[PDB]
Design a protein around this ligand. Structure first.
Ligand SMILES: Nc1nc2ccccc2[nH]1
Ligand SMILES: O=[N+]([O-])c1ccc(O)cc1
Ligand SMILES: O=[N+]([O-])c1ccc(O)cc1
Lengths: 188, 185
């Protein structure tokens, strides 16, 4: 991850005019869509929290959690820490990132700070559901000037995405003011 | 450096009881002593600053500054960012690290934050002096409980080092209270 830290702009885009900031969300959303597409119900929920973090969750199969035989850490951690640009860039540029994966009857949790895992991926409970949830707090050390998410920028993009990804239900919720939207297109 | 950030204790020592914290200084001092041995005057100065950062400097030749053929960045940056454990570990666990090198008639400076260079090593002026200086501010995200340097812990180890590195002069200064020592065997 140090290459990204060294020159963030080369990976996420402009870190001062808000474009890179929102790009962080879109990158996570792209992964979420992929996940949602591989399951039956296909629902993604994007939430703008009051503390200016954003969470993206999908009800897919859950990203893999088993230990990578070469890397020596869980697959999820490899996905988050190795290398659209990929969620690892997002992790790298986030002051905090919370990862929750529901898969095989188990809830797995992990926390990262500036892309550094605070502990290995851990099974903390049981669950009847499946899916992946990522919540991130953009690093204020990286993102300057524009540091708060604009609902409209997210809504417009999610709306466009919904038509391209038929069958995928996409919900947008803004806990700062209670605004909500639901983009769902059939087509196929 | 992510391996280091992930398990700091395994590289620098216990991050809660002061062990690791003081080890940071010792790692830098090892490099400094090596530089001093290679120079003419042979003196190093270790300063505990008021803000609980520590600087270590030598009057040696100055660490290499040219671009590393394989890494593509200055040799100094390679030293600070590529894996005693080495000063890259110290860099990794420091919220800030300032590097200054006086070599071949030029002054070179670079700043790091959590092991990340803020810019490439750069020539900032001319000088007749030679040597290297590194000042680091231990990350308080990593070091807990014991977060302030203890003069006696540093002094004890520096005294041991003075005997072992006989020709080298070692000064310890504490700016928090004016305390100082001079170890020279
Ligand atoms: N605050 C802060 N910024 C960081 C950048 C890289 C690794 C750890 C870090 N902690
Ligand atoms: O891979 N990822 O980073 C993801 C995948 C799915 C999701 O809902 C959020 C993030
Ligand atoms: O290589 N280093 O990190 C050094 C070298 C010399 C010095 O005085 C301080 C630090």
């Amino acid at each position: 991850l140090d290459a990204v830290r060294k020159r963030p702009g080369m990976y996420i885009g402009d870190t001062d005019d808000g474009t890179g900031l929102h790009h962080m969300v879109f990158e996570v959303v792209d992964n979420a869509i992929d996940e949602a597409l591989a399951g039956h119900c296909k629902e993604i929920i994007v939430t703008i929290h009051a503390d200016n973090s954003v969470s993206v969750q999908d009800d897919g199969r859950g990203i893999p959690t088993g230990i990578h035989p070469e890397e020596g850490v869980s697959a999820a951690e490899v996905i988050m820490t190795v290398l659209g640009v990929g969620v690892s860039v997002v992790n790298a540029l986030s002051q905090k990132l919370e990862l929750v994966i529901q898969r095989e009857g188990k809830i797995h949790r992990q926390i990262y700070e500036h892309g550094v895992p605070q502990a290995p991926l851990a099974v903390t409970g049981e669950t009847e559901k499946t899916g992946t949830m990522v919540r991130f707090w953009p690093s204020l050390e990286t993102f300057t000037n524009v540091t708060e998410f604009e609902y409209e920028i997210l809504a417009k993009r999610l709306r466009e995405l919904s038509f391209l990804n038929s069958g995928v239900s996409i919900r947008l919720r803004d806990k700062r003011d209670g605004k909500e939207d639901h983009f769902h297109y059939e087509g196929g």
